[PDB]
CSV table of C-alpha atoms (C1' of nucleotides) and ligand atoms in Angstrom, one decimal:
chain,number,residue,atom,x,y,z
G,1,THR,CA,-0.3,0.1,-0.1
G,2,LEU,CA,2.4,2.6,-1.2
G,3,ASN,CA,0.3,5.2,-0.6
G,4,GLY,CA,-2.2,4.1,2.3
G,5,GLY,CA,-1.6,7.8,3.8
G,6,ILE,CA,-2.8,9.8,1.3
G,7,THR,CA,-6.0,7.3,0.1
G,8,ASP,CA,-6.7,7.1,3.2
G,9,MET,CA,-6.6,10.9,3.9
G,10,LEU,CA,-8.9,11.7,0.7
G,11,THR,CA,-11.3,8.6,1.4
G,12,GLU,CA,-11.9,10.5,4.9
G,13,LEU,CA,-12.5,13.7,3.3
G,14,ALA,CA,-15.1,11.9,1.2
G,15,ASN,CA,-17.0,11.0,4.0
G,16,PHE,CA,-17.1,14.2,5.4
G,17,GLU,CA,-18.2,15.6,2.4
G,18,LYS,CA,-21.3,13.1,1.9
G,19,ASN,CA,-22.5,12.5,6.0
G,20,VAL,CA,-22.6,16.2,6.0
G,21,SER,CA,-21.2,18.1,4.2
G,22,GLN,CA,-23.9,16.2,1.5
G,23,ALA,CA,-21.8,17.3,-1.3
G,24,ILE,CA,-22.1,15.0,-3.2
G,25,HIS,CA,-20.4,15.9,-5.7
G,26,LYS,CA,-17.2,16.6,-3.6
G,27,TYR,CA,-18.1,13.0,-2.2
G,28,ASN,CA,-17.7,11.6,-5.9
G,29,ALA,CA,-14.9,13.0,-6.6
G,30,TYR,CA,-12.6,12.3,-3.7
G,31,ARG,CA,-13.1,8.8,-3.6
G,32,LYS,CA,-11.8,8.8,-7.8
G,33,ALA,CA,-9.3,10.6,-6.9
G,34,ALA,CA,-8.0,8.2,-4.1
G,35,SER,CA,-8.9,5.2,-6.2
G,36,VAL,CA,-6.3,7.0,-9.4
G,37,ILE,CA,-3.8,7.2,-6.2
G,38,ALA,CA,-4.5,4.0,-4.8
G,39,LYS,CA,-3.3,2.4,-7.8
G,40,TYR,CA,-0.4,4.9,-9.3
G,41,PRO,CA,2.8,2.4,-9.1
G,42,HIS,CA,5.1,4.7,-7.0
G,43,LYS,CA,5.7,5.6,-4.0
G,44,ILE,CA,4.0,9.6,-4.1
G,45,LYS,CA,7.3,12.1,-3.1
G,46,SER,CA,4.8,15.5,-4.2
G,47,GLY,CA,1.8,16.6,-5.1
G,48,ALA,CA,2.3,18.0,-8.1
G,49,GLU,CA,3.7,13.9,-9.0
G,50,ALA,CA,0.2,13.3,-8.0
G,51,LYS,CA,-1.8,16.4,-10.4
G,52,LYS,CA,0.0,14.6,-13.3
G,53,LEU,CA,-3.2,12.2,-12.6
G,54,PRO,CA,-6.2,12.2,-14.2
G,55,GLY,CA,-9.3,13.1,-10.7
G,56,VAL,CA,-6.3,15.3,-8.3
G,57,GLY,CA,-5.9,18.5,-9.5
G,58,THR,CA,-5.0,22.1,-7.7
G,59,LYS,CA,-6.8,21.5,-4.0
G,60,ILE,CA,-5.9,18.1,-3.4
G,61,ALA,CA,-2.6,18.6,-4.7
G,62,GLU,CA,-2.1,20.9,-1.9
G,63,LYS,CA,-3.1,19.0,0.4
G,64,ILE,CA,-0.9,16.6,-0.5
G,65,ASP,CA,1.2,17.8,-0.2
G,66,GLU,CA,0.4,19.3,3.6
G,67,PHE,CA,-0.2,15.4,3.7
G,68,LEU,CA,3.5,14.5,3.0
G,69,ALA,CA,5.3,17.2,5.1
G,70,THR,CA,3.2,16.6,8.6
G,71,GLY,CA,1.3,13.3,8.3
G,72,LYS,CA,-1.7,15.1,8.4
G,73,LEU,CA,-4.3,17.7,7.3
G,74,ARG,CA,-5.5,19.8,9.9
G,75,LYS,CA,-8.9,20.0,7.8
G,76,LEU,CA,-9.5,16.7,9.2
G,77,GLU,CA,-8.0,17.8,12.2
G,78,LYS,CA,-10.3,20.0,13.3
G,79,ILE,CA,-13.1,18.1,11.4
G,80,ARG,CA,-12.1,15.2,14.0
G,81,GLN,CA,-13.0,17.5,17.0
G,82,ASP,CA,-15.8,19.1,15.7
G,83,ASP,CA,-18.7,17.0,17.7
G,84,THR,CA,-21.6,17.5,15.9
G,85,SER,CA,-19.3,16.2,12.3
G,86,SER,CA,-18.5,13.7,15.1
G,87,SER,CA,-21.6,12.2,15.6
G,88,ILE,CA,-23.4,12.1,11.9
G,89,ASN,CA,-20.8,11.3,10.6
G,90,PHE,CA,-21.6,8.0,13.6
G,91,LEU,CA,-24.6,7.6,13.2
G,92,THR,CA,-23.9,6.6,9.5
G,93,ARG,CA,-22.6,3.9,9.9
G,94,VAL,CA,-25.9,2.5,10.7
G,95,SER,CA,-27.4,0.8,8.2
G,96,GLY,CA,-30.7,2.8,7.2
G,97,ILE,CA,-29.4,5.8,8.4
G,98,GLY,CA,-28.0,8.4,5.9
G,99,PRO,CA,-27.0,11.9,5.9
G,100,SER,CA,-30.2,13.5,6.2
G,101,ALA,CA,-31.7,11.4,9.2
G,102,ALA,CA,-28.0,11.3,10.6
G,103,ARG,CA,-28.5,15.0,11.2
G,104,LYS,CA,-31.9,15.3,12.4
G,105,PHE,CA,-31.2,12.7,15.5
G,106,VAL,CA,-28.4,14.8,16.4
G,107,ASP,CA,-31.2,17.5,16.5
G,108,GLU,CA,-32.8,14.9,18.9
G,109,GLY,CA,-30.3,14.4,21.0
G,110,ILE,CA,-29.3,11.3,19.7
G,111,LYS,CA,-26.0,10.7,19.0
G,112,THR,CA,-25.0,7.4,20.3
G,113,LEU,CA,-25.1,3.8,20.2
G,114,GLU,CA,-26.5,4.1,23.1
G,115,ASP,CA,-29.6,6.8,22.7
G,116,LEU,CA,-30.4,4.1,19.7
G,117,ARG,CA,-31.1,1.4,21.5
G,118,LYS,CA,-33.1,3.6,23.7
G,119,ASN,CA,-34.7,4.6,21.3
G,120,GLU,CA,-35.2,2.0,19.2
G,121,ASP,CA,-39.3,3.5,18.4
G,122,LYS,CA,-37.6,6.5,16.6
G,123,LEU,CA,-36.3,3.9,13.6
G,124,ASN,CA,-37.8,2.8,10.5
G,125,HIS,CA,-37.6,-0.9,10.3
G,126,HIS,CA,-34.4,-1.3,8.5
G,127,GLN,CA,-32.7,0.8,10.8
G,128,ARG,CA,-33.7,-1.4,14.0
G,129,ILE,CA,-31.7,-4.2,11.8
G,130,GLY,CA,-29.1,-2.0,11.0
G,131,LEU,CA,-29.4,-1.2,14.5
G,132,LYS,CA,-29.3,-4.6,15.5
G,133,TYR,CA,-26.7,-5.2,14.1
G,134,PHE,CA,-23.7,-3.0,14.4
G,135,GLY,CA,-21.9,-4.8,15.4
G,136,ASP,CA,-22.1,-7.9,12.9
G,137,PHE,CA,-22.1,-5.5,10.2
G,138,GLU,CA,-18.5,-3.4,10.9
G,139,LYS,CA,-16.9,-7.4,10.1
G,140,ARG,CA,-15.6,-8.3,6.5
G,141,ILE,CA,-16.0,-11.7,5.2
G,142,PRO,CA,-13.2,-13.9,5.1
G,143,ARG,CA,-13.8,-15.7,0.9
G,144,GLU,CA,-13.5,-19.3,2.8
G,145,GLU,CA,-16.9,-18.0,4.4
G,146,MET,CA,-17.8,-16.6,1.2
G,147,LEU,CA,-16.9,-19.3,-0.8
G,148,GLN,CA,-19.8,-21.2,2.0
G,149,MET,CA,-22.7,-18.8,1.6
G,150,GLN,CA,-22.4,-19.2,-1.9
G,151,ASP,CA,-22.0,-23.4,-2.3
G,152,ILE,CA,-25.1,-22.5,0.5
G,153,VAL,CA,-27.7,-20.2,-1.5
G,154,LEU,CA,-26.5,-22.0,-5.0
G,155,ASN,CA,-27.6,-25.5,-3.2
G,156,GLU,CA,-31.1,-24.2,-2.0
G,157,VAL,CA,-31.6,-22.1,-5.0
G,158,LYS,CA,-31.7,-25.8,-7.1
G,159,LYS,CA,-34.3,-26.8,-4.1
G,160,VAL,CA,-36.8,-24.3,-5.7
G,161,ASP,CA,-36.0,-25.0,-9.7
G,162,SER,CA,-33.4,-26.2,-11.5
G,163,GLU,CA,-33.8,-23.4,-13.9
G,164,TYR,CA,-32.9,-20.5,-11.8
G,165,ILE,CA,-28.4,-19.8,-11.9
G,166,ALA,CA,-27.1,-17.8,-8.6
G,167,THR,CA,-23.9,-16.3,-9.2
G,168,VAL,CA,-22.5,-14.3,-6.8
G,169,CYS,CA,-21.0,-10.7,-8.2
G,170,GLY,CA,-19.2,-7.9,-6.1
G,171,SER,CA,-15.9,-8.2,-4.7
G,172,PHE,CA,-16.0,-11.8,-4.2
G,173,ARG,CA,-16.5,-12.7,-8.4
G,174,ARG,CA,-13.1,-9.8,-8.6
G,175,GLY,CA,-11.7,-12.1,-6.3
G,176,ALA,CA,-10.9,-10.3,-3.0
G,177,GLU,CA,-10.0,-12.5,-0.4
G,178,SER,CA,-12.0,-10.4,1.8
G,179,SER,CA,-15.7,-9.4,1.3
G,180,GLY,CA,-18.2,-6.5,3.0
G,181,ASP,CA,-20.5,-8.5,1.9
G,182,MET,CA,-22.6,-11.2,-0.6
G,183,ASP,CA,-23.8,-10.2,-3.3
G,184,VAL,CA,-26.0,-12.4,-5.1
G,185,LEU,CA,-27.7,-11.7,-9.3
G,186,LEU,CA,-30.5,-13.9,-10.2
G,187,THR,CA,-31.9,-15.3,-13.0
G,188,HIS,CA,-35.0,-17.3,-14.4
G,189,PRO,CA,-35.6,-18.2,-17.9
G,190,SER,CA,-39.3,-17.4,-17.0
G,191,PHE,CA,-38.3,-13.6,-16.6
G,192,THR,CA,-37.5,-12.1,-20.2
G,193,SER,CA,-37.3,-8.3,-21.1
G,194,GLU,CA,-39.9,-9.8,-22.4
G,195,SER,CA,-42.3,-11.5,-20.3
G,196,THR,CA,-42.4,-12.0,-16.9
G,197,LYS,CA,-44.5,-15.6,-17.0
G,198,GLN,CA,-44.0,-17.3,-13.7
G,199,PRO,CA,-44.9,-14.0,-10.2
G,200,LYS,CA,-42.9,-14.3,-7.9
G,201,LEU,CA,-39.9,-15.2,-8.5
G,202,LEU,CA,-37.9,-13.9,-5.9
G,203,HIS,CA,-40.0,-13.9,-3.2
G,204,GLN,CA,-39.6,-18.1,-3.7
G,205,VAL,CA,-36.1,-17.9,-3.2
G,206,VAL,CA,-35.9,-15.3,-0.5
G,207,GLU,CA,-38.6,-18.0,1.5
G,208,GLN,CA,-36.4,-21.1,1.0
G,209,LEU,CA,-33.2,-19.3,2.2
G,210,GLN,CA,-35.5,-17.8,5.3
G,211,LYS,CA,-36.4,-21.5,6.0
G,212,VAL,CA,-33.1,-22.8,6.3
G,213,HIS,CA,-32.0,-20.1,8.7
G,214,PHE,CA,-29.7,-18.4,6.1
G,215,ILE,CA,-31.0,-15.1,5.6
G,216,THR,CA,-32.4,-14.1,9.0
G,217,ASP,CA,-33.9,-10.5,8.4
G,218,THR,CA,-35.2,-7.9,5.4
G,219,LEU,CA,-34.0,-4.9,5.0
G,220,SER,CA,-36.2,-4.3,1.9
G,221,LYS,CA,-37.3,-6.3,-0.7
G,222,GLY,CA,-39.5,-5.6,-4.0
G,223,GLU,CA,-39.7,-7.6,-7.4
G,224,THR,CA,-36.2,-8.0,-8.1
G,225,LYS,CA,-34.7,-6.7,-5.3
G,226,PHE,CA,-33.8,-8.1,-2.0
G,227,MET,CA,-32.0,-6.5,0.8
G,228,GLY,CA,-31.0,-8.1,4.1
G,229,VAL,CA,-29.2,-9.7,6.7
G,230,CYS,CA,-28.3,-13.8,6.7
G,231,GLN,CA,-25.6,-16.1,8.9
G,232,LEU,CA,-23.5,-19.4,8.3
G,233,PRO,CA,-24.1,-22.4,10.4
G,234,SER,CA,-22.0,-22.4,13.2
G,235,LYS,CA,-21.0,-26.3,14.5
G,236,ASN,CA,-22.0,-27.7,18.0
G,237,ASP,CA,-20.2,-26.0,20.8
G,238,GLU,CA,-18.7,-23.3,18.2
G,239,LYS,CA,-19.2,-19.5,18.5
G,240,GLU,CA,-22.3,-18.2,16.6
G,241,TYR,CA,-20.7,-16.9,13.0
G,242,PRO,CA,-21.2,-12.9,12.7
G,243,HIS,CA,-24.9,-11.7,11.0
G,244,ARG,CA,-23.9,-10.6,7.3
G,245,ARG,CA,-25.2,-8.2,4.7
G,246,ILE,CA,-26.9,-10.0,1.5
G,247,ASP,CA,-27.8,-8.6,-1.7
G,248,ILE,CA,-29.8,-10.7,-4.3
G,249,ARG,CA,-30.9,-8.7,-7.8
G,250,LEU,CA,-33.5,-10.8,-10.1
G,251,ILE,CA,-32.0,-9.4,-13.9
G,252,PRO,CA,-33.9,-10.3,-16.7
G,253,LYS,CA,-32.5,-13.3,-18.1
G,254,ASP,CA,-31.5,-12.3,-21.2
G,255,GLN,CA,-29.9,-8.9,-20.1
G,256,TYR,CA,-27.0,-11.4,-17.8
G,257,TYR,CA,-23.9,-9.6,-19.1
G,258,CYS,CA,-25.4,-5.9,-18.7
G,259,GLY,CA,-26.4,-7.3,-15.4
G,260,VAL,CA,-23.2,-9.2,-14.1
G,261,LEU,CA,-21.2,-6.7,-15.8
G,262,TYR,CA,-23.2,-4.1,-13.2
G,263,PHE,CA,-23.2,-6.6,-10.3
G,264,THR,CA,-19.4,-7.0,-10.4
G,265,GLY,CA,-18.8,-3.5,-10.5
G,266,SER,CA,-16.9,-2.2,-8.7
G,267,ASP,CA,-18.6,1.2,-7.8
G,268,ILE,CA,-15.6,2.9,-9.0
G,269,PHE,CA,-15.0,1.1,-12.1
G,270,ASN,CA,-18.8,1.5,-12.9
G,271,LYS,CA,-18.9,4.3,-13.0
G,272,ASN,CA,-15.9,5.2,-14.9
G,273,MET,CA,-16.5,2.8,-17.4
G,274,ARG,CA,-20.3,5.0,-17.9
G,275,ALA,CA,-18.9,7.7,-17.8
G,276,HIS,CA,-16.6,7.0,-20.8
G,277,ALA,CA,-19.7,5.2,-23.1
G,278,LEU,CA,-21.1,8.6,-23.0
G,279,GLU,CA,-17.8,10.5,-23.4
G,280,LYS,CA,-18.4,7.6,-26.4
G,281,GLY,CA,-21.8,8.0,-27.3
G,282,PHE,CA,-23.5,5.3,-25.3
G,283,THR,CA,-25.3,4.5,-22.4
G,284,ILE,CA,-25.0,1.8,-20.6
G,285,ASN,CA,-27.4,0.4,-17.5
G,286,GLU,CA,-27.8,-3.1,-15.8
G,287,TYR,CA,-30.0,-3.8,-18.0
G,288,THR,CA,-28.6,-2.9,-21.7
G,289,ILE,CA,-26.2,-0.7,-24.0
G,290,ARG,CA,-27.6,2.4,-26.2
G,291,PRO,CA,-26.8,4.9,-28.4
G,292,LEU,CA,-27.2,8.0,-27.9
G,293,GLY,CA,-29.0,10.1,-30.7
G,294,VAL,CA,-27.9,13.1,-32.1
G,295,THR,CA,-30.1,15.0,-29.5
G,296,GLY,CA,-30.1,13.8,-26.2
G,297,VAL,CA,-32.4,10.3,-26.5
G,298,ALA,CA,-31.3,6.6,-25.8
G,299,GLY,CA,-31.7,4.5,-29.3
G,300,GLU,CA,-32.1,1.0,-29.4
G,301,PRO,CA,-30.9,-2.0,-27.3
G,302,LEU,CA,-27.3,-2.8,-29.4
G,303,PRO,CA,-26.9,-6.7,-29.4
G,304,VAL,CA,-25.3,-8.4,-26.6
G,305,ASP,CA,-23.6,-12.0,-27.1
G,306,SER,CA,-21.0,-11.0,-24.1
G,307,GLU,CA,-18.9,-8.9,-21.1
G,308,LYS,CA,-16.4,-8.2,-23.8
G,309,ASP,CA,-18.9,-6.8,-26.1
G,310,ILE,CA,-19.5,-3.8,-24.0
G,311,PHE,CA,-16.2,-3.0,-23.6
G,312,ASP,CA,-16.0,-3.0,-27.7
G,313,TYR,CA,-18.8,-0.5,-28.0
G,314,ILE,CA,-16.8,1.8,-26.6
G,315,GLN,CA,-13.5,1.1,-27.2
G,316,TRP,CA,-12.0,0.1,-24.5
G,317,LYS,CA,-10.0,-3.4,-24.2
G,318,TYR,CA,-11.3,-6.5,-21.9
G,319,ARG,CA,-11.0,-5.7,-18.3
G,320,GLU,CA,-10.8,-9.1,-15.6
G,321,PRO,CA,-13.2,-8.6,-13.3
G,322,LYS,CA,-9.9,-9.3,-11.5
G,323,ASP,CA,-8.8,-5.6,-12.2
G,324,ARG,CA,-12.3,-4.1,-12.1
G,325,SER,CA,-11.6,-3.1,-8.4
G,326,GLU,CA,-11.2,0.7,-8.8
T,1,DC,C1',-15.7,30.6,-17.6
T,2,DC,C1',-19.4,26.7,-17.0
T,3,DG,C1',-21.6,22.2,-17.1
T,4,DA,C1',-21.6,17.7,-16.4
T,5,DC,C1',-20.5,14.0,-13.4
T,6,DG,C1',-24.3,6.2,-13.9
T,7,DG,C1',-27.7,4.5,-13.9
T,8,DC,C1',-31.5,2.9,-11.6
T,9,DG,C1',-34.6,-0.6,-7.0
T,10,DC,C1',-37.6,0.0,-2.1
T,11,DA,C1',-39.3,3.3,1.3
T,12,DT,C1',-41.9,6.6,3.2
T,13,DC,C1',-44.3,10.8,2.4
T,14,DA,C1',-46.8,14.9,0.6
T,15,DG,C1',-49.8,16.0,-2.2
T,16,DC,C1',-54.6,14.8,-4.8
F,1,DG,C1',-55.9,4.9,-4.1
F,2,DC,C1',-52.6,7.2,-7.3
F,3,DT,C1',-47.9,9.8,-8.8
F,4,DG,C1',-43.4,12.9,-8.0
F,5,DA,C1',-40.0,13.6,-5.0
F,6,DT,C1',-36.4,12.4,-1.5
F,7,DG,C1',-33.6,9.3,1.0
F,8,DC,C1',-30.7,5.8,1.2
F,9,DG,C1',-29.2,1.7,-1.5
F,10,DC,C1',-26.6,-1.3,-4.7
F,11,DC,C1',-22.6,-1.9,-8.2
K,1,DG,C1',-13.1,19.5,-6.1
K,2,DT,C1',-12.0,18.2,-11.2
K,3,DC,C1',-12.0,17.9,-17.0
K,4,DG,C1',-12.8,19.0,-21.4
K,5,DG,C1',-14.1,22.9,-24.8
B,1,CL,CL1,-20.7,19.0,-3.6
B,2,CL,CL1,-5.2,13.7,9.0
B,3,CL,CL1,-33.0,-0.3,-20.5
B,4,MN,MN1,-21.1,-6.8,-1.8
B,5,MN,MN1,-24.1,-5.8,-1.5
B,6,MN,MN1,-20.3,-1.3,-1.6
B,7,NA,NA1,-4.7,15.6,-12.9
B,8,NA,NA1,-26.2,4.7,6.7
DNA sequence: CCGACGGCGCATCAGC
DNA sequence: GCTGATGCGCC
DNA sequence: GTCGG
């Protein structure tokens, strides 16, 4: 981690702008620079050297020089010492509490974990569960556990209907040795871009995972996207495994490639890639890649039979999932 | 100097 | 009930 | 906050 000190600083600045400033573009700018710097293969000696990188500008170069000189940034030193900012940043670590709700809670005098615990009745469902598992959700998932979880989901899904295909994406598919959570893309030939011949396709699967006590809680759910909690089973006399986040996204089967591109990420890889498509006259979503017409509007879906096809359209050499960890 | 910055699912709420 | 705005979430 | 035009 050649420039861990700098990228940590930028990440902290990004979080501040998002959770406290509510300046979402500053948030995206900081994350973009942190990312471009993380992959830069030299130990950075000056801001001017970082500025040569796209995404790193004058302001970030200045902060980089301060950080290399002193080992800190005064701006962040002060943000840390600010009670309202610290509280707001903390509350936003609970799933379901964002910048708006965090500020509101701080206003009402709710600003710690203990305050939250005694004011459970002030939380919506999602927040209640986010709080319930606050500690567990901060732990990472070793790839070995991800492999155990994969086997359970794929095997249980098989038991509902052999025609389902479940694919674990997210950092797992990019080959990470540890994951923040588990993301599962689901397809079934009853659900395509042209028709929904079978209702309840996602629910059925959620039910089955709930039946075997894998899924333990639900944050939100609809016809195509489930967001909840899950837990691996423990052996006799062994400590319980931590509760984990799970996301399941049902995608039309004929649009699997755009879907697996989306759900593989990273999030920054996706932003970068979709921005580039626009520059080249295309717009990409989890469903389709389409042409931009002369006016502002998108054309019919272009044919796609591979992830690589999407890269071709926008004139990018193909990138393996393992190299999409931006 | 400026305008754009990726795209979209689910929960909640205000107005009708 | 509907619809659109907003929040929070996903990668 | 950074970028292209
Ligand atoms: Cl902003
Ligand atoms: Cl610092
Ligand atoms: Cl589409
Ligand atoms: Mn994930
Ligand atoms: Mn996830
Ligand atoms: Mn994520
Ligand atoms: Na630059
Ligand atoms: Na949160």
